[PDB]
């Protein structure tokens, strides 16, 4: 049952995530009438779907050494490329998600002063700069992505640090900080400030429109922060825990593979948060159907 349960989770997440991300890309492109987007929110949302799609397209090329015979079949040349490719996609999606939450903070807490620099040109420059920062952040990943000789005739793609006794700590902490710790604090801080400043002083809170606006935005800000935490906290909780662990057991291995699947589920759930919780997008999508 273990040999069928694990592939099913990855197979369902990859297919469902590809469907969700393709829907967002298709709708935003159609909204742009096959032209460069003139909307800053549309620039961020379509780039996030692309990186999420890239993160899910490359999922089967990274997990085939975990579900079969535990053998890497792509050689050393593809071992370094794919491992850096998977690391780049996760960081870029997180950075675009953090940039998208900061962009929403500016459009709400600074509705007047932010119109000077919330331009489609600046949005494209920021998103291109996010890819540049992602390549730098995955530098230790591709510098040490080498084949690892397991006992027996099987080998697998992995990270071979020059000083595994001592270099194992900074490698985990720097990835924990840049991809889980720092972005979650910024994203959570951005949305709590939005909920505290989503209405003007004179807005008629007694009116049903203001109450309906507060309720809908509140549950969207919670869903964004909750999906990111749930899909990435266990992955980095186990990342820090295994530092003390020397000989993992079957229960830890099963948990770790589940945590890997949850990380991919973030790129599957991100498009559906926008599809379901955005009334304007959802209504427009239903019309085409």
């Amino acid at each position: 049952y273990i040999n069928i349960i694990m592939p099913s989770v990855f197979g369902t997440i990859c297919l469902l995530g590809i469907i969700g991300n393709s829907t967002v890309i298709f709708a935003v492109v159609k909204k742009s009438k096959l032209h460069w987007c003139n909307n800053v929110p549309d620039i961020f949302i379509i780039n996030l779907s692309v990186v999420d799609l890239l993160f899910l397209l490359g999922m089967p090329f990274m997990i085939h050494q975990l579900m079969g015979n535990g053998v890497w079949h792509f050689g050393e040349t593809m071992c370094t490329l794919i491992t850096a490719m998977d690391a780049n996609s996760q960081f870029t999606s997180t950075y675009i998600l953090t940039a998208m939450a900061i962009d929403r903070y500016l459009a709400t807490v600074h509705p007047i002063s932010s119109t000077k620099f919330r331009k489609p040109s600046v949005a494209t420059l920021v998103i291109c700069l996010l890819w540049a920062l992602s390549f730098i952040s995955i530098t230790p990943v591709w510098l040490y992505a080498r084949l690892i000789p397991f006992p027996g005739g099987a080998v697998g793609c992995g990270i071979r640090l020059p000083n595994p006794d001592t270099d194992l700590y900074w490698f985990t902490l720097y990835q924990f900080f840049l991809a889980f710790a720092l972005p979650f604090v910024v994203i959570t801080a951005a949305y709590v400030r939005i909920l505290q400043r989503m209405t003007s002083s004179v807005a008629p809170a007694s009116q049903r429109s203001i109450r309906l606006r507060t309720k809908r935005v509140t549950r969207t800000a919670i869903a964004i922060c909750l999906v990111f935490f749930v899909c990435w906290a266990p992955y980095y909780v186990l990342q820090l825990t295994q530092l003390s662990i020397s000989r993992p057991t079957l229960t830890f291995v099963y948990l770790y593979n589940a945590a890997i699947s949850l990380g991919y589920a973030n790129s599957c759930l991100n498009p559906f948060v926008y599809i379901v919780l955005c009334e304007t997008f959802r209504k427009r999508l239903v019309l085409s159907v």
Binding site: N3, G70, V141, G158, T172, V253
Partner: peptide, 17 residues
Amino acid sequence: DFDMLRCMLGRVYRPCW
């Protein structure tokens, strides 16, 4: 169907110590 007790670092393996 293999000895899935290998150490991991991220989404790829690492040599056990």
